[PDB]
Design a protein around this ligand. Structure first.
Ligand SMILES: Cc1ccc(C2CC2)c(-c2ccc3c(c2C)CCCO3)c1[C@H](OC1CC1)C(=O)O
Ligand SMILES: Cc1ccc(C2CC2)c(-c2ccc3c(c2C)CCCO3)c1[C@H](OC1CC1)C(=O)O
Ligand SMILES: [Cl-]
Ligand SMILES: [Mg+2]
Ligand SMILES: [Mg+2]
Lengths: 51, 139, 142, 50
């Protein structure tokens, strides 16, 4: 339902699987790697045109 | 299919022209973007998606169409991406642009005049009439 | 009437938002213009006119809508200008949806087009985008 | 039916004006009841489309 786009360290990377959303960070899986990204550096985008 | 679109960029006078075509009707939308980037391409798709039932967009492997910014726009708007109707349409667009180029100072004005002429020319319906007919029939 | 539109400008974050609304359907188009000038208004109308059967546009007495450059665009595209308050209620509706989704995007122009998407696709029954296509195609097919 | 010409001769674009002739460097127009000669670069000749 959701997809997460994020920046490490400038170019936006993604889409990545959303595993968990916290108060100050989000846990995602981009390909085969699990990453912990701060909220300010991640965009969680819902598929709105579908549903 | 009423929801199939083709997007590609063409260039004139050193400027970038992003052209979208409704394949089933030949209706076109065009915009002069300040840079051929994924951010400008994604912003173009958002405007297109909120306007027509955009289900599938077919582009080449340009770095602006394969960018992450476009993937987020297509995902949010519910658009599927696939990687010569648009290329033949760019030739038609540049033809009409040259016919009206001297009538305006800015290239972007001649572009929108050319899109106007294309979408309103009958044969019989015009391209602008066909896309509205096709989409309303699908509803 | 399928060819009546209303255009007006609203402001958010110091930027100018030019909004066009199809009165019969409530369908809207919006674009962030770099300046509230007649040249940007006329370029917006050309894009609008080559897209829908734009026959009459209702605006206020702003110096950008009464400019000569807009008159030339309307004459070339065959548009008549007139100077229910649909656009004023629509500016509130657009800015309402913009504020609801503003944090989802960096650029204001992105939130603008998301809000236009949300408005034209919302069912409450046809949607705004479905009504304008239904109204215009009915006039074409008949 | 015919054409309209928009022109500047001091600021704000003036017109529409009747088109009489288009030259290499000037255009002969009639704005209302007055005959004017305007350079090409200060005149927009727009064909009646739509
Ligand atoms: C500046 C910027 C950088 C990265 C991205 C995407 C991959 C992460 C976007 C972007 C693009 C499309 C889109 C959304 C966003 C967030 C969210 C909802 C609707 O579809 C943007 C965007 O600008 C672009 C639109 C012209 C913005 O304003 O944030
Ligand atoms: C820069 C400029 C100054 C004056 C005018 C108007 C006074 C007569 C125009 C203009 C406006 C509308 C229009 C046409 C033109 C020539 C031609 C045919 C189609 O409708 C422009 C125009 O820029 C505007 C369009 C954004 C341009 O690029 O010349
Ligand atoms: Cl956390
Ligand atoms: Mg290409
Ligand atoms: Mg106003």
């Amino acid at each position: 339902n959701f997809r997460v786009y994020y920046r490490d360290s400038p170019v936006w990377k993604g889409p990545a699987k959303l595993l968990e959303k916290g108060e100050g960070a989000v846990v995602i899986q981009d390909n085969s790697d699990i990453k912990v990204v701060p909220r300010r550096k991640a965009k969680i985008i819902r598929d709105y045109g579908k549903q």
